[PDB]
Design an enzyme around this catalytic site. Structure first.
Site, PDB file in Angstrom:
ATOM      1  N   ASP B 225      19.509  33.976  15.731  1.00  0.00           N
ATOM      2  CA  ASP B 225      20.685  33.446  15.060  1.00  0.00           C
ATOM      3  C   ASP B 225      21.940  34.214  15.500  1.00  0.00           C
ATOM      4  O   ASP B 225      22.185  35.338  15.053  1.00  0.00           O
ATOM      5  CB  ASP B 225      20.503  33.531  13.549  1.00  0.00           C
ATOM      6  CG  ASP B 225      21.718  33.066  12.790  1.00  0.00           C
ATOM      7  OD1 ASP B 225      22.531  32.309  13.356  1.00  0.00           O
ATOM      8  OD2 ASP B 225      21.867  33.485  11.627  1.00  0.00           O
ATOM      9  N   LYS B 232      29.063  35.180  13.378  1.00  0.00           N
ATOM     10  CA  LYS B 232      28.669  36.001  12.226  1.00  0.00           C
ATOM     11  C   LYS B 232      29.833  36.946  11.866  1.00  0.00           C
ATOM     12  O   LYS B 232      30.699  37.189  12.705  1.00  0.00           O
ATOM     13  CB  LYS B 232      27.400  36.806  12.556  1.00  0.00           C
ATOM     14  CG  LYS B 232      26.193  35.914  12.845  1.00  0.00           C
ATOM     15  CD  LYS B 232      24.855  36.636  12.831  1.00  0.00           C
ATOM     16  CE  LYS B 232      24.288  36.782  11.435  1.00  0.00           C
ATOM     17  NZ  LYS B 232      23.627  35.555  10.932  1.00  0.00           N
ATOM     18  N   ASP B 237      15.816  36.776  11.751  1.00  0.00           N
ATOM     19  CA  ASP B 237      16.003  35.643  10.873  1.00  0.00           C
ATOM     20  C   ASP B 237      14.819  34.658  10.863  1.00  0.00           C
ATOM     21  O   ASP B 237      14.934  33.566  10.328  1.00  0.00           O
ATOM     22  CB  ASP B 237      17.353  34.969  11.138  1.00  0.00           C
ATOM     23  CG  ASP B 237      18.440  35.505  10.210  1.00  0.00           C
ATOM     24  OD1 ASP B 237      18.258  35.420   8.972  1.00  0.00           O
ATOM     25  OD2 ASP B 237      19.460  36.030  10.699  1.00  0.00           O
ATOM     26  N   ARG B 300      19.831  27.141   5.298  1.00  0.00           N
ATOM     27  CA  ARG B 300      19.652  26.205   4.193  1.00  0.00           C
ATOM     28  C   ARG B 300      19.585  24.754   4.692  1.00  0.00           C
ATOM     29  O   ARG B 300      18.850  23.933   4.144  1.00  0.00           O
ATOM     30  CB  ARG B 300      20.736  26.396   3.121  1.00  0.00           C
ATOM     31  CG  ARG B 300      22.149  25.964   3.505  1.00  0.00           C
ATOM     32  CD  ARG B 300      23.168  26.571   2.543  1.00  0.00           C
ATOM     33  NE  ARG B 300      23.258  28.009   2.743  1.00  0.00           N
ATOM     34  CZ  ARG B 300      24.049  28.854   2.075  1.00  0.00           C
ATOM     35  NH1 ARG B 300      24.856  28.444   1.101  1.00  0.00           N
ATOM     36  NH2 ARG B 300      24.017  30.134   2.396  1.00  0.00           N
TER      37      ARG B 300
HETATM   38 CL   LIG Z   1      21.972  29.625   5.018  1.00  0.00          CL
END
Ligand SMILES: [Cl-]
Ligand SMILES: [Cl-]
Ligand SMILES: [Cl-]
Lengths: 449, 449, 318
Positions: B225, B232, B237, B300
């Site tokens: 990631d 970032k 991750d 998510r």
């Molecule tokens: Cl997330």
């Protein structure tokens, strides 16, 4: 009887079966504890590495590792300096072991609320060397204590008081200047930088006069540096003054045939309604002017007038020590100081002294092309160019204030004066006392010649 | 014969004179080595602290300290679980010592160029408990290896291949979806997030079917990631996927009467000319939409469609595990995971399981008033509010995708999955395998009820 | 009952909303004295030499940079068999000091405590309640608290100042010693203490810390009755390593993640052995910098007043 005995072992030297079973291979500073032959006490086998590669620093580090491994013992005898077979002469081994023992035992617990160890003994016929090492290490630990002291305890007035007390112990001559008596000396940079703080500045001169050579040492004593109004990108910015004071305290014991004068400007750099402003101009003791373009470059401004005073028409040589610039550390790293001098012979003297002491310095050049970065639109110079090269620019700035013809060296010790990474070898977390032992070895060499 | 024997000592227990002279006072994890009585081998005295305060974690930590102190020995016998007098039952002592030994011996040296220790033996009649502990710790170390693996080796296709091989070892059912077969599943978030990378995404389902209760585990497998186009404020991750895979691999050995399905979306999040854009809208498997307001909140978005698939009309319970949010760590610190669930009974089951495993979790609330921070001007929700509370908002985001009536818990393990501070107790620097043992203990408890 | 609880909440809102130039520490102490007089709550205001005598070293160190002198106020409701101590952080203006922040609302804890105390005479609870209120400004100045300074507290322990913006815990420390000294059956502190809280909990939820599960349930149920959102966070033993100092007994800032938990552990050190204690960290919900909603305005909210009142009601019954 010794509760613990530390035995130095070079690679290939015999140790018992238990020691082998624990993985003892004589790596420098490796320690394996075992019962004594009679079962009544403890033996530490302590690695010294290959006999051929060992240096005085090996012995210093091994002694510090030994003292850290003592446990609850009351008495420790270090036999490390008896290990022969390396190229390190017996006197050099003894001096280094004595130093490493004191440096490795150092603790700063004065401000904790709530040591079974009563005696450390260094075994060797080289008793003079042991005494020399203990004294150098004790001076280093004095500097560590001063740096570690909270700025609220070690204010400029309190620091001046402590120096007076230290001087009294050998009857070093000591003059403390404050208030109107300080104003009379014309140290404009010190009084300008120090004015924002509620604490008033001090200037201290500390003289060892036991000679034909007279050496001036100048130490930066900013007891708390907040960056002033400009801010930083803080109690350890008196590391230079600490090193100078500590070196001076060691001289009466060593009895060097050399006159040495310490020059110590002490102040806080604080933001305040009356603090030094960006754009202000300081008129120095030599009549030249500096424009304050950044209030965080206050050290060079404080030192300027003291260098004029110290080199005035008399000291044969002037050495300044200061936690001066952060730019140094970016390329040199956290454990190496910067040395500046136009005198190649003086450079070699300082560098060889640092090698004897086990302290890392790199000589940097007084680059003529960096002087263009001292230019001001208003004054004779600026205290900050806002350009790369500030470590070199600061050295060039200071050079302006040393009277014509006087040999001079500048030690910028910002990074190695305070260890904010873990302890290692003979060096603790926090105040290190860096440069004390280099200064002592430099003064020893100068006194011989 | 054992080259080394480790003896557990509670405070007040007798040790020899040498041990006392070295400062042994039975502090938890304190180790003092000495010769055996016959002088042929080594004894480690290992602190277990006061008998009254000792826990299973004390034993786990003491075993890890023992294995770290072995030196060059070929064979080590841990007698720690024989120490009685604490309130920790014999089986719990044995399980913890076995775990701590394996966890403390862990090393990840696969990528170094250029272990005399052949046997660790745990002394105890509780052989079942030893076997259980070894298996839990071996699963934890599998997860550590996966997290530690460079992202260039453990790409999404390579990770899917490794899971297939692991599944084959017990004949766990394993389906790997790629290319057109992956597109058919409608996991839109996974394919959108994964598209910028040169590495194609994968989706893996891994089933243990040895029952009346069926549990779905969902693990976030982002193998690298970068933050995507948004950046970032990176190989770790996939810690959630690692924990889920490892827990599944432990089930055949334990033989739990419980069906468990793993659901594992695997991808890289990279910047690229074809990468997911800020302002893009993802239409999920349930027909709802998400606006991408920050490409670094990709986890998510990837999990969303997998939760739809995993909870679809059948699993009695779904638990997701993910290194999801950085906001967690600010108030919880680096060693504690966050637990979310609307089901109080499930919360207690997970929390008690973590206590048995020695892993720290804090339950955080699914705050109804934070749902306003999911609002979008374009889609049904956003993946980033740019406001405080992202850890809670992420949990609420995921909750939207779990089918009505299905019990669910979410474990956010971002901080404790990777130790970027030093090693301590049974935990190494780097990949930790955090949550493996909590998951195993949770599944054990669910299988009983 | 509802009118009185809401009027107390609005008193706290007024105090928080008041410009720091009006509500200085001396002015705040004066206002508390006037409020106390209205029911004859006992009120003692400590200033100057009388303040120095109490040995509240953290308060005097933090407060010294400011032109405004600090104050300490004790406010007692004594209408009982249970005695409760409430400690409220009253930093009337917090600039961050010399270290800077990453400012008038950092007295929200003191506001909540004062307001709750003012409501008790009307309700007539059979419970003795003492408020303990350290009041100061945190300002940069030539005489301000320095990074690296060490504070020697009322219990003899020491704190190293590693960041001047974590001044609240340093001020509260000595007051917790005084409040729990050998007597209050329970001590509850309320403070706008840490910014780290908000990152994971969001802007409308406070943090609750206590080692006592029964006290936790009492506070949480009280907050539910009051319609105020709290989350219990753990006093994590493994975060105590982040309190370690190379010079003093502890630091006021680790510069590491977990400051909300570390601050609670810091405060815990100063509560005398055996005394039940809870800590409410209300930094985010004490001031609404987003729009008004439901019964909550923009600005000072009076958060925790009604939770405190409901907690005291429940404690008085049992
Ligand atoms: Cl997330
Ligand atoms: Cl400077
Ligand atoms: Cl604070």
């Amino acid at each position: 009887a010794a509760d613990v005995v530390a035995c130095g072992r070079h690679t290939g030297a015999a140790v018992g079966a238990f020691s082998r079973r624990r993985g003892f291979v004589a790596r420098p500073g490796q320690v394996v504890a075992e019962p004594s032959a009679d079962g009544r006490a403890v033996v530490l086998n302590v690695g010294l590495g290959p006999a051929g590669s060992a240096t005085a620093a090996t012995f210093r580090a091994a002694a510090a590792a030994s003292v850290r491994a003592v446990g609850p013992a009351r008495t420790l005898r270090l036999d490390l300096a008896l290990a022969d077979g390396s190229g390190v002469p017996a006197a050099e081994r003894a001096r280094a072991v004595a130093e490493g023992a004191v440096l490795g035992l150092y603790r700063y617990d004065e401000y904790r609320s709530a040591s079974p160890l009563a005696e450390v003994i260094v075994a060797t016929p080289e008793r003079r060397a042991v005494a020399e090492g203990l004294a150098a290490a004790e001076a280093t630990c004095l500097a560590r204590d001063l740096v570690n002291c909270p700025a609220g305890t070690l204010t400029p007035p309190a620091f001046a008081d402590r120096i007076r007390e230290l001087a009294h112990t050998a009857g070093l001559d000591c003059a403390v200047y404050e208030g109107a008596g300080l104003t009379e000396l014309g140290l404009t940079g010190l009084t300008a930088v120090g004015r924002g703080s509620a604490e008033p500045p001090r200037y201290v001169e500390l003289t060892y006069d036991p000679p034909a050579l007279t050496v001036g040492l100048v130490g930066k004593g900013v007891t708390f540096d907040s960056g002033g109004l400009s801010l930083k990108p803080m109690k350890a910015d008196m590391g230079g003054a600490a090193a100078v004071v500590a070196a001076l305290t060691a001289l009466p014991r060593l009895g060097l045939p050399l006159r040495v004068r310490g020059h110590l400007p002490l102040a806080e750099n604080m933001p305040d309604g009356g603090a030094l402003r960006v754009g202000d101009v300081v008129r120095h003791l030599d009549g030249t002017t500096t424009e304050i373009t950044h209030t965080d470059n206050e050290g060079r401004v404080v030192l300027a007038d003291v260098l004029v005073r110290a080199s005035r028409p008399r000291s044969d040589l002037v050495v300044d020590v200061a936690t001066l610039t952060s730019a140094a550390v970016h390329a040199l790293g956290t454990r190496t100081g910067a040395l500046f001098t136009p005198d190649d012979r003086l450079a070699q003297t300082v560098l060889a002294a640092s090698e004897r002491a086990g302290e890392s310095f790199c000589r940097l050049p007084l680059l003529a092309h960096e002087r263009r970065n001292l230019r001001s639109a208003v004054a004779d110079r600026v205290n900050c160019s806002h350009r790369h090269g500030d470590t070199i620019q600061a050295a060039l700035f200071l050079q302006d204030f040393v009277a014509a013809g006087v040999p001079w060296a500048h030690l910028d010790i910002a990074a190695p004066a305070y260890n904010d990474e873990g302890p290692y070898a003979e060096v603790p977390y926090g105040g290190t006392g860096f440069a004390v032992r280099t200064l002592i070895e430099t003064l020893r060499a100068l006194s011989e010649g």
